[PDB]
C-alpha cells in the first residue's frame, strides 16, 4: 500500500512529533467518562447527549452520491451538538505543541474540526465523538496536567514563566497541585463543578524534556535538527519558484 513517513528529523522532538501524528502515544493515567464530561462542561455527567437536530434515521436526507458512501460518525447519526475541547500547552517543554495536537486529530479521528493557535488548540466534533478524542489526548502522554490545561477561555499562560511549583499559570485556577497530584474542580470555562478530579502526578522536568514536541535551545535546539530545517527551506524554495512559473 503506502507506509507514511510523516515528518523529517532524527531528534527526540521529531520522533515525538511522529508519535503524536501516528497516535503512537503512551497511556499515562485513567480519567473516568463522567469526570471527563464534568471537566468539559457541556452536559451533566452521565446524561444523554443533547441534540441540535433530529437523528439521521428521522431525517429525509437529500439524494447525494457522497452521503451514500460516507458513513456518518455516531455523533452525526444521532444529531449531537458540535462541542469542543481546548488545550493550552506550556512552552517550557509541555509534551504537546498546538499544530501536533491538530495533526493528531486530523490523522487519527474521523470528522474533526481542529484549530491551531499559539496559546490554545481546539477541536470541535459532534459531542460524543469529541469525548473519545478528548479522552485520548487527556489520558496519554500528549497531556501533562502541570504543563498543560483544559481551557475553553482565558488561556493566558503558555508563554509565561512557570509558577514556582512548576505548574503553568491559570488565571481562572481550574486545576492545581494538591498533595503531589494535579486536581481540577472547575469546567474548562471556569465554572466550579461539584467534584474534584485527580489527574495524576505531573511529569518531572527531565521526563517532559524527553517527551516534548517543542524545540528549546537548552534541551533539543531547533538549530540542531538539520533535516527539519532543510525540509522547511525546500518547501519554501519550491513554493517560491512555482509561484513564478509552475514548472518543475
Amino acid at each position: 500500500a503506502y507506509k507514511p513517513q510523516y515528518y523529517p528529523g532524527s531528534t527526540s522532538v521529531a520522533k515525538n512529533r511522529r508519535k503524536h501524528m501516528s497516535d503512537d502515544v503512551e497511556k499515562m493515567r485513567d480519567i473516568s467518562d463522567e469526570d471527563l464530561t464534568a471537566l468539559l462542561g457541556h452536559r451533566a455527567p452521565g446524561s444523554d447527549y443533547p441534540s441540535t437536530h433530529p437523528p439521521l434515521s428521522e431525517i429525509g436526507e437529500p439524494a447525494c452520491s457522497v452521503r451514500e458512501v460516507v458513513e456518518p460518525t455516531p455523533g452525526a447519526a444521532a444529531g449531537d451538538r458540535l462541542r469542543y475541547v481546548q488545550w493550552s500547552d506550556s512552552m517550557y517543554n509541555a509534551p504537546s505543541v498546538p499544530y501536533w495536537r491538530s495533526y493528531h486529530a486530523a490523522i487519527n479521528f474521523r470528522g474533526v474540526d481542529p484549530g491551531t493557535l499559539s496559546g490554545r488548540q481546539v477541536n470541535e466534533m459532534r459531542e460524543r465523538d469529541m469525548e473519545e478524542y478528548a479522552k485520548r489526548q487527556a489520558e496519554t502522554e500528549m497531556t501533562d496536567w502541570g504543563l498543560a490545561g483544559m481551557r475553553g477561555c482565558t488561556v493566558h499562560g503558555h508563554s509565561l514563566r512557570l509558577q514556582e511549583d512548576g505548574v503553568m499559570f491559570d488565571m481562572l485556577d481550574r486545576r492545581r497541585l494538591e498533595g503531589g497530584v494535579i486536581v481540577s474542580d472547575k469546567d474548562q470555562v471556569g465554572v466550579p463543578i461539584d467534584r474534584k478530579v485527580n489527574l495524576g502526578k505531573p511529569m518531572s522536568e527531565a521526563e517532559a524534556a524527553k517527551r516534548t514536541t517543542f524545540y528549546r535551545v537548552d534541551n533539543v535546539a531547533f538549530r540542531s535538527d538539520k533535516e527539519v530545517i532543510e525540509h522547511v527551506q525546500k518547501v519554501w524554495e519550491l513554493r517560491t519558484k512555482y509561484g513564478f512559473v509552475p514548472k518543475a
Binding site: L162, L172, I229, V235
Partner: protein, 563 residues
C-alpha cells in the same frame, strides 16, 4: 549584552505601582519561574484611575460603565503581576494603557496628519492660466497666491461679503507650503512658504529628490484637524481644491467662476493631485486617504528618520516599523476594521522594550559582515535563505534564553512579527531589494512554525502561507513590486502583525541608500517641522503622549465649549 537587558530589568526586576516586582516577585531576566501574587488591578495606579472613573460614570449617568469586576468569572485582571513598557531607544516607562490609540493623542495626531494631507501640482494650473487667459506667472504672483491661500485654506473668505468663516482659533494647524525642483523658484518664493529641499535633506538625498522631480513645483496641503475628524480622508483633496480654486480667482483677477476655473478644478482634484492612497473595495468600502489605501512605500516615505539619521539605517527601519505598525494595526485593523479593546499589544513589539531592535541589529550585523556591507549582497535565493535562517534562529534562541522576553511577547503573533521584521529587514538592507526582503519574511515564518509547533493566532498565517509563492508571482492580483503593496494587497487585507512590518522591510531596502522608497513628492511634503506629529521621531512622540505631556494636539473644540 542583549539590547533588551535594561528594558527587561525595568519590567521584571523593578517595582511598578505596588506589583512587588522590586521584592517578592523580582526576577533575574533569565529565570524560568516567577510568582503569581493575584493582587488584582489595585497594584496598578493607572487601572485604579480607570476603575474610579468608571464608577463615577456609572453613578453620574445612571447606566453601568467600566468595572474590572465584570471580567469573565468575576476574576479581575492582575492575577499575574501588571508590568510596564519602555519605549524602545528611550528611558520612557509607561503602562500599556498609555499606548492605546484612544488614550494617546500623539497616535491620533499621526493619523490625522496623514489623513488631512495631500500634494497638489502647480505647473498644470499655471499652464492653464497662461494659455486660457494669457496671464504671466511670476514669483510675485505666486507669493501673493501663497499669502492669500494660507489665509483662505482654513476656511476664510476672499471674494464675497457678509460671510461666515471658520474660527482661526480652531484651525491653526492648517496651512500650505510649496516645494520645487526649480532652484530659482525655490529662492524667489518667500521663505515662510518653502520646504527647502537643500535645507531639509543631506546633499546626496537632495540631489536624488531633485533629479526625480525635475523643475516641477508642488503644494504640500494640510487641511484642519477638526475637519478631518468631523469628516473622512476623502474630504481632504476636496477641501484643498475649494480654497486653491478661490485663491487662483483672486490672485489672477479671473471671473469668479468661468470655464478656466473649471479646468483649474479638474487640475486640483484630479490631474495635479497626489493623494496618500486611493479607494478600496466594497466589502471594506472607503474612499481615498484612508489607511487601507495607503501603500507601504508611501507610509515609509512619510516617515522622516532617513533624512535625519541615514548613518543608522537600522534605526530608520525601526522608527518606520513604529509609526507604520501603530497606524496599520492599532488605528486601521484594530479600529476602522474592528474596534473595542483592539490591537495595542499586537503593535507594541514594534516600539517597546528593545526586543525587535536587538534582533534586527543582530541580523544586520550578520549580513553586513558576511556580504561586505549594506546593499552589497546579491538578491538571490541563496542570500535570502542564509540571512533569513540565521536571523530566525537567533531570535528563537533569544526568546528561549530570556524567559522575560517570551513573557513580554506572550502571543505567538507578536513573536512571529518581531522575528520576521528582523529577518526581512536584514535581508532588504543587505540586498537593497524589497522583494528579497518579503521572501525572507515568509521563510522566517515557516521556520518559526516548525521550531515552536505554533505560530500566531488562528488566522495569522493566511498571508504567510500564500506568501512565498506570491512574492514573485506575476498573476493579476498577486504580482506587485513590494513598494507598491499596501493594506489592500489581497493577501494582506485582514490581519494584524504584518502591514507595519512590511513597511519596515520596504524602508530597509532604501534606508541609508536612497532618499525615498516610492514617491519623492510624499517624502518632501512631510519634511516639515510645522506638521504636528514628529514623523522623524515617532517613538519619542508616542512616549511623550504616553506621559500626557505631548503638547501638539490639534483639532480640539475647547475654544467653543465651557470648561
Amino acid at each position: 549584552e542583549p539590547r533588551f537587558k535594561k528594558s527587561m530589568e525595568t519590567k521584571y526586576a523593578k517595582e511598578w505601582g505596588s506589583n512587588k516586582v522590586g521584592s517578592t516577585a523580582k526576577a533575574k531576566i533569565t529565570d524560568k519561574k516567577t510568582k503569581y501574587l493575584r493582587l488584582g488591578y489595585q497594584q496598578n495606579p493607572r487601572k485604579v484611575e480607570m476603575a474610579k472613573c468608571g464608577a463615577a460614570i456609572t453613578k453620574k449617568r445612571g447606566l453601568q460603565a467600566y468595572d474590572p469586576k465584570l471580567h469573565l468569572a468575576g476574576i479581575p485582571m492582575g492575577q499575574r503581576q501588571l508590568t510596564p513598557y519602555t519605549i524602545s531607544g528611550t528611558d520612557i516607562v509607561c503602562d500599556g494603557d498609555d499606548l492605546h490609540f484612544v488614550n494617546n493623542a500623539a497616535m491620533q495626531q499621526e493619523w490625522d496628519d496623514i489623513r488631512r494631507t495631500c500634494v497638489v501640482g502647480l505647473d498644470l494650473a499655471h499652464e492653464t492660466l497662461e494659455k486660457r487667459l494669457g496671464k504671466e506667472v511670476t514669483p510675485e504672483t505666486i507669493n501673493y497666491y501663497l499669502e492669500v491661500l494660507n489665509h483662505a485654506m482654513p476656511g476664510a473668505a476672499i471674494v464675497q461679503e457678509h460671510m461666515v468663516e471658520t474660527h482661526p482659533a480652531l484651525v491653526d494647524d492648517c496651512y500650505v507650503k510649496i516645494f520645487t525642483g526649480d532652484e530659482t523658484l525655490q529662492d524667489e518664493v518667500d521663505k515662510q512658504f518653502v520646504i527647502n529641499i537643500d535645507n531639509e535633506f543631506p546633499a546626496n538625498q537632495a540631489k536624488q529628490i531633485k533629479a526625480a522631480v525635475g523643475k516641477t513645483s508642488w503644494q504640500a496641503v494640510h487641511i484642519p484637524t477638526i475637519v478631518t475628524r468631523t469628516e473622512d480622508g476623502p474630504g481632504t483633496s476636496r477641501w484643498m481644491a475649494m480654497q486653491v480654486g478661490m485663491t487662483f480667482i483672486s490672485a489672477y483677477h479671473m471671473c469668479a467662476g468661468e470655464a478656466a476655473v473649471g479646468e483649474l478644478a479638474f487640475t486640483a482634484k484630479h490631474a495635479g493631485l497626489v493623494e496618500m492612497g486611493d479607494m478600496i473595495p466594497a466589502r471594506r468600502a472607503r474612499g481615498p486617504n484612508e489607511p487601507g489605501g495607503l501603500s507601504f512605500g508611501h507610509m515609509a516615505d512619510i516617515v522622516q528618520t532617513n533624512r535625519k539619521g541615514p548613518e543608522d539605517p537600522v534605526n530608520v527601519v525601526l522608527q518606520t516599523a513604529s509609526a507604520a505598525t501603530m497606524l496599520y494595526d492599532q488605528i486601521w485593523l484594530g479600529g476602522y476594521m474592528s474596534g473595542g479593546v483592539g490591537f495595542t499589544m499586537y503593535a507594541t513589539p514594534a516600539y517597546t522594550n528593545d526586543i525587535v531592535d536587538d534582533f534586527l541589529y543582530w541580523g544586520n550585523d550578520y549580513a553586513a559582515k558576511k556580504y561586505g556591507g549594506n546593499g552589497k549582497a546579491k538578491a538571490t535565493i541563496d542570500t535570502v535563505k542564509d540571512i533569513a535562517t540565521e536571523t530566525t534562529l537567533y531570535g528563537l534562541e533569544a526568546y528561549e534564553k530570556y524567559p522575560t522576553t517570551l513573557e513580554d511577547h506572550f502571543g505567538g503573533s507578536q513573536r512571529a512579527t518581531v522575528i520576521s521584521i528582523a529577518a526581512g529587514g536584514a535581508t532588504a538592507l543587505a540586498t537593497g531589494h524589497s522583494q528579497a526582503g518579503l521572501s525572507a519574511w515568509y521563510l522566517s515564518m515557516y521556520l518559526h512554525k516548525e521550531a515552536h509547533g505554533r505560530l500566531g493566532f488562528y488566522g495569522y498565517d493566511l498571508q504567510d502561507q500564500c506568501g512565498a509563492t506570491n512574492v514573485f508571482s506575476i498573476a493579476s492580483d498577486e504580482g506587485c513590486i513590494g513598494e507598491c503593496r499596501g493594506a489592500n494587497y489581497p493577501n494582506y487585507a485582514m490581519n494584524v502583525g504584518h502591514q507595519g512590518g512590511y513597511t519596515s522591510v520596504v524602508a530597509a531596502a532604501h534606508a541609508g541608500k536612497d532618499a525615498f522608497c516610492v514617491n519623492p513628492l510624499v517624502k518632501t511634503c512631510f519634511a516639515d517641522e510645522l506638521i504636528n506629529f514628529d514623523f522623524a521621531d515617532p517613538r519619542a512622540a508616542f512616549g511623550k503622549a504616553a506621559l500626557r505631556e505631548w503638547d501638539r494636539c490639534a483639532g480640539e473644540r475647547a475654544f467653543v465649549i465651557p470648561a
